[PDB]
Amino acid sequence: SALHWRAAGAATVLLVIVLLAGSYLAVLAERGAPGAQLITYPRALWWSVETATTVGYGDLYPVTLWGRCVAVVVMVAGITSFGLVTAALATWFVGREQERRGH
Amino acid sequence: SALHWRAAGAATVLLVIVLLAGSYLAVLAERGAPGAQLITYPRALWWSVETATTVGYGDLYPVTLWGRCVAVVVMVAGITSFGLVTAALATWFVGREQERRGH
Amino acid sequence: SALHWRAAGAATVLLVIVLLAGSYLAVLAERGAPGAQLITYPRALWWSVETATTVGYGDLYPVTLWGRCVAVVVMVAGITSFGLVTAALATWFVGREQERRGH
Amino acid sequence: SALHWRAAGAATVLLVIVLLAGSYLAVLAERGAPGAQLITYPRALWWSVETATTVGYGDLYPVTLWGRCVAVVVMVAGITSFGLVTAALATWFVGREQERRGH
Amino acid sequence: DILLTQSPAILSVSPGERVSFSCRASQSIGTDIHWYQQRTNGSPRLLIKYASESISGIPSRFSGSGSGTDFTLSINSVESEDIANYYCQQSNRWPFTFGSGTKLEI
Amino acid sequence: DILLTQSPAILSVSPGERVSFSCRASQSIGTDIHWYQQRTNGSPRLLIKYASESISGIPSRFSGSGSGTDFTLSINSVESEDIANYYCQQSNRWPFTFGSGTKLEI
Ligand SMILES: [Ba+2]
Ligand SMILES: [Ba+2]
């Protein structure tokens, strides 16, 4: 219904797709680079999650240009997503406070 | 009273429970995995906090599938919580600015 | 004037004080612990900043209970501060959009 | 048009400039310091991005006072930028919810 | 898996002298090292935990020090009751492991 | 705990020659190494701080270099007043520790 709540969902589905494509593209970009560790899918997927949340533990990170490019899209999607929910939770709290007042 | 302020509290209590269950589940999931370091409760609890805040220092992180699963719930609770306070502080600032104006 | 803008300032001054007290308390808590690296003020201050912003590089982190306790206050102040500005920038954007419309 | 949407853009352009100046200034500040690793532009630019997003992997960080100073400006620009979009997405969701209601 | 090396295997000291037992970890383990004492036909008994934290009920004579990969268990002025086998144990990484042990001889 | 190795223990050089003292840390310590000079019956005196930062009031003759685990203290054209014992000290990890020292001999 409400756009904000829709954008939230849109962004969660999207984030999930970026996480999945990100894991796949990461491996593709990193394999071929000596010393690269982001080279198998399961751990790449975990890597994408820790990147989107910005937790960063430093157990895995891209070392090639494309990998880092992929990393930037994942970070931006994660940050933009997680920040869009917050904006959604605000339009909700604000719309509900209006009632409890006089609108 | 005000929903937003309630959700904030709800999320803080909740976050604390997830932090506690997270520490416990983490140890349970990581013990049995060679090289795992998230294997005693006190440090696991510190690990959960650095995960929920996304600070990440990289001194401790899960290396098993369940551990990482537990990690994802902690990150999401931390991020969702910390972002819900912000949405709460906004409904407050917005509701108070309305007065200082003419509503 | 406007509360939100005031809270922002209040939180920035406060954050600066927590950063300073944090650097001092960190050293105090970590010295005495074998292997501790957060033991001189200048780097402790840099540590506090990377903690409050949650950047975390992992070049420095507390290894004692009090240090970690101090760490938690710094993280929470940083996160709460940085999230309070955002709530401030929202009450501003929202209050200004109202005009450009019809309130 | 709308200020919030303008500030968002302003902050994105700005962030990009800070990222670029940051990469350049970082190298300038770190070269000359034994053990420094943030000493070539391409990786410095990647470093600036991981800093502004606060992802932090710990593969690269400044070890000199100016470098860290540069780091603080990048973190603050990244955080302030990413948090300004969120405040922008909130003024949007809030302005649109008003219609779907009765304003 | 973490290997704990305890050398020498036997330690000879004169009554009342100061003695130090060594424990090296094949990798950095912070201060996640613990010490146990086992007398002939006895069960192990926690002496020191986390490299230097005194346990309640253990003679002040006993102390521990170290961090990273080098750990030392010390006894001030040894005495007959100290004659036994000493072991170190780490809890930094799964699975927990034990050192080979050192025998105290007076 | 960080071990600072200073070898050789004695260093013999001809008047005016260039001399270098060595200091190896059992682990990477960045540039958190400092140098002191102690003459016979004297107190230690800070020469270099943080591996290479000159201290105010110390002959330009003195310089320091290194990072990680290898550090060097150098003196350009030694001279009688330099005859003394030299120590290195680290502040990277608690507790601070000192090297065994090197004696300069002309
Ligand atoms: Ba972060
Ligand atoms: Ba990190």
UniProtKB/Swiss-Prot annotation, chains A, B, C, D:
What is the protein's known function?
A: Acts as a pH-gated potassium ion channel; changing the cytosolic pH from 7 to 4 opens the channel, although it is not clear if this is the physiological stimulus for channel opening. Monovalent cation preference is K(+) > Rb(+) > NH4(+) >> Na(+) > Li(+).
Further details from the record: The amino acids 62-79 are situated in the membrane and are important for channel structure and properties.
Q: Name one GO cellular component term.
A: voltage-gated potassium channel complex
Its UniProt domain note says:
The cytoplasmic C-terminus is involved in the gating mechanism.
The residue ranges crossing the membrane are: 7-29, 67-90
Q: Can you state the subunit structure given in the record?
A: Homotetramer.
Q: What GO MF terms are annotated?
A: identical protein binding; voltage-gated potassium channel activity
Compartment(s) of residence:
Cell membrane
- Name the predominant localization: membrane
Any one Gene Ontology BP term: action potential
Give the top-rank taxon of the lineage listed in the UniProt record for this protein. Answer: Bacteria
Name the UniProt record assigns to this protein = pH-gated potassium channel KcsA
Intramembrane: 41-51, 52-59
Q: Which UniProt keywords apply?
A: Cell membrane, Ion channel, Ion transport, Ligand-gated ion channel, Membrane, Transmembrane, Transmembrane helix, Transport
Residue ranges of the motif Selectivity filter: 54-59
Gene expressing this chain: kcsA
Membrane topology, as annotated, equals: Multi-pass membrane protein
Protein family membership: Belongs to the potassium channel family.
What is reported when this gene is inactivated? Cells grow slower and to lower myceliar densities.
**Native source organism of the sequence:** Streptomyces lividans
Q: Which residues lie on this side of the membrane: Extracellular?
A: 30-40, 60-66
